[PDB]
Structures are given as structure tokens and as C-alpha cells.
């Protein structure tokens, strides 16, 4: 259905298996309906809370597709707001969990020069 769904399945891990608890199923549920409405942005703060405790969106050992679908819509919207930041170094501290998640997956899916996000450290 898009470019990045391809390069994810070019990778050993799609692949599998999971899996899925009563908990985990309902999680990737609300994160797909969020995308359906179009209201990613006004849920960044949730995503960040979720990403604070869990390494990946649905508490899995490796990224699921959800971790890519969301990342596709998230990446631009984040890097836009890092431009328009006045402090940023707030933004950073305010959204450090979405930031380490991006940094992981953008290298996992070999995003171009582009595209890619600064990422200081």
C-alpha cells in the first residue's frame, strides 16, 4: 500500500511471529483508528508516553507494522516542529522518546539523506 511497507517486508523480521495479548491487540487498535481519523499530531503526547515505558509501540521485541505505519506519518510532522521550535532543547526533552524511536526506525528502514532527521546526542 506504500513504499515503506515494502522495505519493512524486505527485512528478515517481517518475519514474525507474534503473537498478541488482549492488551496488545487493543493497543495497535487505537493507534490505527488514530491514523484513520487523520488526528496523528494531536496525539503526539500519548505516543510519547507509550514510547516512554515501551521500546516499540505495541510492546514487542522487534518493530511491528504499526511501528512503521505510524512512523511514516510521524517522521515529517516531527521534523517540521523541530524547525519551528523556539527552544528545542525543550522540544528535545519534551519528546525524547518519540525521538529515539524515530532514530531507530529511520536507520532500520534506510531513509535517505533527506528525509532523515538531525538527531544530536
Amino acid at each position: 500500500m506504500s513504499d515503506l511497507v515494502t522495505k519493512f517486508e524486505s527485512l528478515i523480521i517481517s518475519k514474525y511471529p507474534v503473537s498478541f495479548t488482549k492488551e496488545q491487540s487493543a493497543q495497535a487498535a487505537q493507534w490505527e483508528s488514530v491514523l484513520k481519523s487523520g488526528q496523528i499530531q494531536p496525539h503526539l503526547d500519548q505516543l510519547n508516553l507509550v514510547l516512554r515505558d515501551n521500546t516499540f509501540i505495541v510492546s514487542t521485541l522487534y518493530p511491528t507494522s504499526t511501528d512503521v505505519h505510524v512512523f511514516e506519518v510521524a517522521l515529517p510532522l516531527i521534523k517540521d516542529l523541530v524547525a519551528s521550535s523556539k527552544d528545542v532543547k525543550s522540544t528535545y526533552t519534551t519528546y525524547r522518546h518519540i525521538l529515539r524511536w524515530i532514530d531507530y526506525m529511520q536507520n532500520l528502514l534506510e531513509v535517505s539523506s533527506t528525509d532523515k532527521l538531525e538527531i544530536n546526542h
Partner: protein, 178 residues
């Protein structure tokens, strides 16, 4: 033929890092190392063939094809911390040390930053598993990042089933006698 890693079940700090390194090598290069258990309080916590000192380094350097990523110098930094700092059962000292890690992990999924773990991640997770003081500090996440990280590696059976292997093994040691 393999090496013999012998680890001790009555040891005050149980050599989980070493058990976990052995299991990785075995997972990729079968029969490289034989694991042996010994319940006995007058016995080193770990033994690789003959060596008792520096056992983790020995395993890690030997199978350098499996242990390659991460700047050597830097894996040394965090193996040190792990071995001499995350074992100590003294909440005042720990907290400081866990903070160092928790800051290191801010914009990271793994300690040294890669797309997959390194020896550093092994040395540390092991240390924290042996030291049961750290159980409560997680489980209830004083250091959010550290709790997220540790929780991840837990899901990998090479890490999170390391305990059962030990429990099972010691069960068999009592059978083979008795």
C-alpha cells in the same frame, strides 16, 4: 571440542552476564562452550576452563566474530561499570550509577547506540539481574529509560530464560546424585 564454563549456584553474585554470553555463542556456533553447574559456597562465581579472573572478557574476545560491533575502548568502559558498580548492594551508590546509564539511554535503544545490542548491553543486564536490589528499582520505574531498556532484553529468551536454565540445571545436579 568445547570450553567448559563452570558457574556456581551458591555464589552471592551469580554470574549471569557470563551465562548469557555463553548462550549467545552457543546459539550461533553450537557446541562452542559447555556449561557446567556446581552448588558449593567455596567456589568461584565463574570459571572458563582454568581462568577465574576476567572470565567475561575472555569469552568476549575469543568469539570476536560474534562480538565485533561497538568501539572496543567503549565496551570496556561499560563492562567495567557493570562489573564493579552495578553489583554493589548499597542504594546510595547504585542510584548514582543507574543515573549514568539512564542518561546514556535517552536517545537510544541500545547502550552504544547500534541497531542491535552489544557486549555492553550483555555485561549490564547481567549485572542488574544478579543484584536483586535492582528488582524493586525497576518494576516501578525510578529510572524510566533503564526500565524500558531492561524490559526489552527480558523478552529475548536468550536473556529472560537464562534463569530457568540455571534452576533446571541445579535440579539435575541434585538428581544425578541423590
Amino acid at each position: 571440542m568445547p570450553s567448559t564454563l563452570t558457574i556456581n549456584g551458591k555464589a552471592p553474585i551469580v554470574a549471569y552476564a557470563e551465562l548469557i554470553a555463553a548462550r549467545i555463542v552457543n546459539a550461533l556456533a553450537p557446541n562452542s562452550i559447555a556449561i557446567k553447574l556446581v552448588d558449593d559456597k567455596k567456589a568461584p562465581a565463574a570459571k572458563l576452563d582454568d581462568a577465574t579472573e576476567d572470565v567475561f572478557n575472555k569469552i568476549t574476545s575469543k568469539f570476536a566474530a560474534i562480538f565485533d560491533n561497538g568501539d572496543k575502548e567503549q565496551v570496556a568502559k561499560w563492562v567495567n561499570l557493570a562489573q564493579k558498580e552495578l553489583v554493589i548492594k548499597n542504594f546510595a551508590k547504585l542510584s548514582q550509577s543507574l543515573e549514568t546509564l539512564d542518561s546514556q539511554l535517552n536517545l537510544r535503544t541500545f547502550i552504544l547506540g547500534g541497531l542491535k545490542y552489544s557486549a555492553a548491553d550483555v555485561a549490564c543486564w547481567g549485572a542488574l539481574r544478579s543484584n536483586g536490589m535492582c528488582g524493586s528499582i525497576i518494576k516501578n520505574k525510578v529510572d524510566v529509560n533503564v526500565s524500558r531498556w531492561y524490559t526489552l532484553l527480558e523478552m529475548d529468551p536468550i536473556f529472560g530464560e537464562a534463569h530457568d536454565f540455571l534452576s533446571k540445571s541445579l535440579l539435575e545436579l541434585k538428581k544425578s546424585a541423590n
